[PDB]
Symmetry: C3
Subunit: 596 residues, 3 copies
Amino acid sequence: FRAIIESPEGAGHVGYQYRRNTGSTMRMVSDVLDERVSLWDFHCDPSGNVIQPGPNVDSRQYLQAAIDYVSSNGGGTITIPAGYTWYLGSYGVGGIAGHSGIIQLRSNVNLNIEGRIHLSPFFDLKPFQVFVGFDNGDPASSGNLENCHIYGHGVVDFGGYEFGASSQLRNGVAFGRSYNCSVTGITFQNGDVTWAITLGWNGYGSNCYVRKCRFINLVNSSVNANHSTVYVNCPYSGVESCYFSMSSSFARNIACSVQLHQHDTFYRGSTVNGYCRGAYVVMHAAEAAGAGSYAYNMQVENNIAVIYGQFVILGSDVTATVSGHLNDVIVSGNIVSIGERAAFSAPFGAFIDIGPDNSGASNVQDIQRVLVTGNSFYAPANITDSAAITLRANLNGCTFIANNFDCRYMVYNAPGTTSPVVQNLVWDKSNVIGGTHANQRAGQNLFDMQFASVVNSTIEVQLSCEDLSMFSCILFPASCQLSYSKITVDSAWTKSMSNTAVFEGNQQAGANVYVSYPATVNLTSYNTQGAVPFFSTDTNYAWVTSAYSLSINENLDFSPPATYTNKANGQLVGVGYNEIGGVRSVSVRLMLQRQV
Amino acid sequence: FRAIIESPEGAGHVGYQYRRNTGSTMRMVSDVLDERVSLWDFHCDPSGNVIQPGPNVDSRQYLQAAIDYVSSNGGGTITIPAGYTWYLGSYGVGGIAGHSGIIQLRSNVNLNIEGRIHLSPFFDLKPFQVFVGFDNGDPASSGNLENCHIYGHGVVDFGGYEFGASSQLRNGVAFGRSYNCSVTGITFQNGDVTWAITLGWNGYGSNCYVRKCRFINLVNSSVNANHSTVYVNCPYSGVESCYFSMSSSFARNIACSVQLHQHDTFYRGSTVNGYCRGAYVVMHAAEAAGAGSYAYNMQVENNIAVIYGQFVILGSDVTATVSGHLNDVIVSGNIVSIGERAAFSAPFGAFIDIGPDNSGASNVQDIQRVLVTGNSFYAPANITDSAAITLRANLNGCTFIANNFDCRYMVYNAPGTTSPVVQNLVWDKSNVIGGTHANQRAGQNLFDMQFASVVNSTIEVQLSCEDLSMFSCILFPASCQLSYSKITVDSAWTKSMSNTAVFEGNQQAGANVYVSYPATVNLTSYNTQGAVPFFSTDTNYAWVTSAYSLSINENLDFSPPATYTNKANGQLVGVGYNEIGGVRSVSVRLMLQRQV
Amino acid sequence: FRAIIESPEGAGHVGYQYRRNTGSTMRMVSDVLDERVSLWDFHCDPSGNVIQPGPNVDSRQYLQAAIDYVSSNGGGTITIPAGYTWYLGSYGVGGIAGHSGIIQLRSNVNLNIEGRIHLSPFFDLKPFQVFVGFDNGDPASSGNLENCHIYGHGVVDFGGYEFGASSQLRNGVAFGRSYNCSVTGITFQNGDVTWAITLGWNGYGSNCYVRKCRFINLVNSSVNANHSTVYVNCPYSGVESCYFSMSSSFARNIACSVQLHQHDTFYRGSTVNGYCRGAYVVMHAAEAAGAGSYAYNMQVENNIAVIYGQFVILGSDVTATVSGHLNDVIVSGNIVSIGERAAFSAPFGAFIDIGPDNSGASNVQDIQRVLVTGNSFYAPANITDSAAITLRANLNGCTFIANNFDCRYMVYNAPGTTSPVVQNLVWDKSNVIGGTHANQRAGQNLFDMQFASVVNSTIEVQLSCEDLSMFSCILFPASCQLSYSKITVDSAWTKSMSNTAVFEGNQQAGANVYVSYPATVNLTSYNTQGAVPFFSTDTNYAWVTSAYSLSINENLDFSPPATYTNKANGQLVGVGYNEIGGVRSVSVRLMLQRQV
Ligand SMILES: CC(=O)N[C@@H]1[C@@H](O[C@H]2O[C@H](CO)[C@H](O[C@H]3O[C@H](CO[C@@H]4O[C@@H](C)[C@H](O)[C@@H](O)[C@H]4O)[C@@H](O)[C@H](O)[C@H]3O)[C@H](O[C@@H]3O[C@H](CO)[C@@H](O)[C@H](O)[C@H]3NC(C)=O)[C@H]2O)[C@H](O)[C@@H](CO[C@H]2O[C@H](CO)[C@@H](O)[C@H](O)[C@H]2O)O[C@@H]1O
Ligand SMILES: CC(=O)N[C@@H]1[C@@H](O[C@H]2O[C@H](CO)[C@H](O[C@H]3O[C@H](CO[C@@H]4O[C@@H](C)[C@H](O)[C@@H](O)[C@H]4O)[C@@H](O)[C@H](O)[C@H]3O)[C@H](O[C@@H]3O[C@H](CO)[C@@H](O)[C@H](O)[C@H]3NC(C)=O)[C@H]2O)[C@H](O)[C@@H](CO[C@H]2O[C@H](CO)[C@@H](O)[C@H](O)[C@H]2O)O[C@@H]1O
Ligand SMILES: CC(=O)N[C@@H]1[C@@H](O[C@H]2O[C@H](CO)[C@H](O[C@H]3O[C@H](CO[C@@H]4O[C@@H](C)[C@H](O)[C@@H](O)[C@H]4O)[C@@H](O)[C@H](O)[C@H]3O)[C@H](O[C@@H]3O[C@H](CO)[C@@H](O)[C@H](O)[C@H]3NC(C)=O)[C@H]2O)[C@H](O)[C@@H](CO[C@H]2O[C@H](CO)[C@@H](O)[C@H](O)[C@H]2O)O[C@@H]1O
Ligand code: NA
Ligand code: NA
Ligand code: NA
Ligand code: NA
Ligand code: NA
Ligand code: NA
Ligand code: NA
Ligand code: NA
Ligand code: NA
């Protein structure tokens, strides 16, 4: 009996009944211990003796053995115990080797990480993906991962190692073709990695989430080619209530917090500091296998960010046989700023970017039905390269309502570069343009419409303070066609502006262009006492449907017309009043209107 | 000693002291095992031998025994172990029998569901409510359920069984008269049920929540009368971060995700696919016992939905002795679309519906102080039956600001049908009207004001693209009274429209009606050289306070007035200018204005 | 052997191997029991015998012993067992004694509170802070607390005791200089306390959160000086999805739910009832040591509140050597109401308050770049002291877009009192002004601009119903300078108003003031048949750049001008038309415009 009791089967001979309840199961101690499982149950030598973790012990095979066994019983939760650091020191084998995998995840096997998991210097300068849910080196031939959750108060620490080569890939958790999988509560820190977590594979997967995680200092070298902390590559998936921080200079040029790359995905309630970018919202044709060619129902909401480049980047692209489409997006409630930096020291600052594809093409995109509403954006006054929207590729629609943008440009695209075709750009009068960059805008147009064409668009400009440094509120080069559009410049704070709206190709004459903006006009009357016509000297007003005074009349003996219409020769004309006769000559600020 | 050790009291004789710490309690193994409890501790035959769960074992009595016992000790958490499916195969007894109850929940007893709970075919074609928190067949005589939480990574599977009769009810969790109760993390799937979860009872309860749950395929037959996945019937309660999906055709006609039926309730951050409806926000008089007659502080926010009917439905109704009121509602940040379907193939598509009561009455409602802001809505171009708001019953107020609606109608109600009395309908100019349905609107009015009366309302129409197919932007039949209102149609994209605003009863003449909209007007001048009057041919402008040109003047020898006022006979009149004399005749596009 | 087995080392001699797996560690029962730890493991007398908790047992030393021991092993989670109430009955010792501390928290030691923790009457009328993370009486000399989480379904009950003196402080959890600490799921109830939870210390700390907690009835006496349920005094920290309720009358005058006092902090998705205030968003100079002098990236979003005073209070202040600044704030998606109360029975009701410092100074603040968007506010019609914004101290900017405010005042500040200097106040036309207080406003100005000066501001007034009781829509006293501003009053529902906008110092004449508002004007024409001038009788219109008719013309034989400009003597003048000659005299409603 003593022998049995001291043997590994001893607990299986000690009887137990819950709280001495006579109606409860007569069990053995081992049965109750068998209800939970930890790494300690597999972290042993060939003779079954427990091995202490530490920097000179590779815990990988033990952890894999745990996962494999629990998988065999239909699943469960393995605890990685608190108060210990568990080092990983070799690559895994089989299907995950194609993915430089360390640990293979398996369906229904959750990890409750309370302790710390730390990479050993075996991985210095090498690729790695710490946890991998694919079961095949080729993801297309991989089975699925289902019902796998990683959670706890613990830590995945990437050991600080730099990348060995830019072409290398590194990841924390790749769930694979992942259905009902999640990461909750975990801190990922101290690396130079490509991603911390990836969800799904080219649209295959569903209901994957990252919640209440922290990601701290995950880029550290110039070798790192590119970093996106969470890539969401399956639908009905998202990121909520996370914290993302970088301190590296390199992160300000390369790192993004989230990629939303399939339909019905979201990014909410998170805080970001030290990153180049906030989120991509993208349909890559190359990734359309699992869930279709459309990214729709895309939500970026209630985030806080200090970034150095662009907050939300929109795009879609094509392959030889597939075309990607992006539609039905909402960006709302976010408060974002470009952090302190020199002008042009990082990628061009923006709230929204319409980004050309990875080859630079701006004529492949099919982006539409986007609503950008109730956001704040700020950039410091020196950051010339800051815009509410950098509109650098074809756009089929984007709607701005009730935002507050306080940066250098409202709408921008660089001249010379791409010439996007623009449709359904709506900038509602309820967008408030801040004043931080007042006096900085010499030579610049607030809305610099450097496009091939604009159609079915609305730009309602409303200033909230003066900025007499700007060349114009809005300017269209002669190369930009403009049709079936509404372009207005509210008069407030514009009295002293030389140019308000500028149409370098006189595009405001178009049949279906609806405009209004202030201008100064010289007029001269006839001599006649009484009701008397005033006519503009210039003849550039053939497009004007009505105009009205924005100036007081300092005279007693006459008054100019309150309102004007035009004449076939391009003059304005209205009827004023000469109390006493005489030819009058006045220079008046008018609101020019066309079909409005 | 050997006998004691092998007995069910053996663990109570093996000493233990935590980590060999001399300051720790000298305990027995059984004490430490007694700190947790699982179904295995009650899942045993009369001789105390453990019984394996499976399809031919009814786990119900064992689970009830666990709950009952733990209840007796002041509560705790029972685990339902992972890696096992636990079948339920009979009805419960006593107080829950009135509710077709299987398991009775008890206060302070939490269930940590890690495994799967599955209904056996005993329940095929029968009613059932799996977990029930009432303790009496009559809910009015029921005690409360308090501090009961169901959580975990497991699954409640309803076995796929269809309803036997439409009158049957089926539920997953009925918390009852429920205070501080919740469901977190659980997947409900594979049924034909009425509800998955219900919270509270007719206003009794508080602080009940459903968080991070999934609801998958919970309608499957034509027998199912009606389905609402979560019913929230107690205050200070809500639904957050959940996932709702249906695949059945029947779900598109019958199923709703959430009912918010008491004050201080919310529905946020959730994704819905395949449902008819998103949420009801309702005060039923019949349900006002526990928390009063007012549903206020109702929040629907930051959800993603593809539905087939209406997203948010507002209502309130009355009984012989109680009147229900709905006020102080916010609907914001939601991105919603009507899924691909034929016109009229499901209930009429809408973002907001003002729904008549269950008997069809439209004159019982008291709905007011609603804010609908910063939402997106889309319906495909063929879906004739799509509206920003279907306003089908009396409305005492609803405010729309800064939404983006892209569907067939903005405001709609069917003619012939109900004639709602409308007050305080506010449609701010910052609502962007999309263009998906451009060219589809022959015979239709964008804002079809098919009401008994409208008062204290604002409709500011702003197009963003042309749609010359529409009969009018806004139309009031002669049967609709209109007073103390503002109705404007911005001119942009309307130059070629025959009708902009239409008042079939000439209601725009009312003393306290403030309007403006474009119109084409024929004018003829007197002969006089110099300042010369132009007068409209028609005499239908007695209501007009001013009008101004929206057309250019192609002439050299004269110009029409820039502006006009009226004359008692209904003509317009203004002063233009004949450089040379002669009677002039022109047809001009004017902005007609009344008291604006 | 029997002796060993019955000894406290007995479990260390019973072998166990997980599920009889031959590849698993050969362990001893004690090893597996050692994987978890509870209060029962320390809740024992000097002889190691377990002691039952209860009202006459002080559990404090036992709980401290547990925390201390687990701390010694690098951390872990101590469970406070369900089904027991654990009373605390004495003060702690050492470093926490300076903080009236009961229990000292330690790094990496989590508490899983499933049972109830209750204060014994030893604490009646005494200060206390139940859990304290400082390790020194002087917080400046304190070490940090890291990785400390308190979570569970249990309860901290403050025993109902009143404060003994107003100067006393009481707290639930003070995390101290706290990094990666949180409270989740816990109910705090039944006290008279200063705070329930405090996070950080004067900017030191990071990543501290309070989530899914309840706070119930935490003020109960007139002695209580001040109450704020959660104070957030470290960056990258916040409050989400919590419930706050008070029932005391005193709470309506003293209690606030949240203080956000450092950068990158948030308050979201919470419900508040019975409180005076919702949140302070503040930079106290006195608290700038740990994270700088700027509070930026401040987010208050998607909350539900019934309060009696002010919802969000903004401020910043200075010390002898430090100046605090507040910028980059977003307040959105909140639905708030002032609960039923008499006028002036609690602190003045407001959605936003710009509050003077604790000494009453209104000239120390540096508050700017605030966006208040997509919120609802309501106050009952009798509550005279209700405002969208009480603007009581210097303001460097605040932007309102697309809110719905339904209360007595829009903008208010009491006359006589403070004279704030106001810059960059933007009130967009998309703010909807409700009608609840229509007919209550005798003697009152809707926008009562009781400031020293206003600059670079926009007030676009839009009514949605009539309120002829109000003295004016907007009024500027002569003492308020006004420059570089836009002030408009839309005409809708104003026809019958005697005063619309009132400039008691004729400030609308300023060179860079842009205004428009309705007025009634008497005009008289010359005799001349044909085109004929009309001139105002009054000469108060020297500032007017144009005016246009808002009235119909009931006459046949003539018409007044549609539009007007001015003359140097301050008259208006326009050209109408006498079909037949004669001097005309008319009283017309005009839209007066200046530079707009
Ligand atoms: C860091 C990051 O994610 N950046 C975004 C861009 O991602 C694109 O580049 C990445 C560079 O790291 C990825 O490519 C790299 O990795 C590929 C995948 O690795 C293979 O497959 C894995 C499943 C295995 O485990 C690996 O062992 C390996 O075999 C590899 O094929 C590439 O050669 C390599 O460079 C990223 O690739 C995606 O990664 C996810 C997550 O792991 C995976 O689920 C996908 O299957 C995989 N996709 C593809 C096509 O391989 C690759 O997409 C991203 O393109 C960009 C979006 O913005 C641009 O495009 C927009 C749309 O046109 C445009 O609007 C915008 O302006 C553009 O800048 O955003 C980040 O830069
Ligand atoms: C599926 C669903 O919930 N639909 C919504 C409507 O709910 C209404 O019909 C339901 C049909 O299933 C419910 O009625 C059914 O159930 C009743 C309750 O069951 C009894 O009581 C339980 C406590 C016991 O456990 C049961 O054993 C049983 O005894 C039963 O009395 C009815 O006879 C039966 O048809 C639903 O009833 C509510 O259910 C909740 C949750 O279980 C419960 O807490 C309530 O006490 C109970 N209420 C009542 C009054 O019984 C019943 O409300 C819902 O009416 C509708 C709202 O929209 C309509 O009304 C709006 C306001 O006028 C109007 O704006 C809109 O246009 C209308 O369509 O939304 C769903 O259809
Ligand atoms: C209840 C509450 O928090 N009210 C808010 C105001 O807080 C200010 O008053 C509080 C009164 O309780 C606090 O002061 C009290 O406590 C101080 C701290 O206790 C000391 O230090 C602790 C760390 C130890 O554990 C204690 O043992 C003790 O030694 C004490 O020094 C004060 O003497 C006492 O009155 C509150 O103090 C802060 O407390 C937090 C949390 O514990 C702590 O992290 C801070 O270090 C500590 N700060 C300071 C400076 O001591 C104190 O701040 C708050 O001022 C107000 C904001 O609104 C006003 O100011 C705005 C900006 O000018 C203005 O816009 C607005 O209109 C004003 O009303 O909001 C609440 O009233
Ligand atoms: Na690979
Ligand atoms: Na849009
Ligand atoms: Na071009
Ligand atoms: Na029943
Ligand atoms: Na409203
Ligand atoms: Na009628
Ligand atoms: Na102190
Ligand atoms: Na602002
Ligand atoms: Na002054």
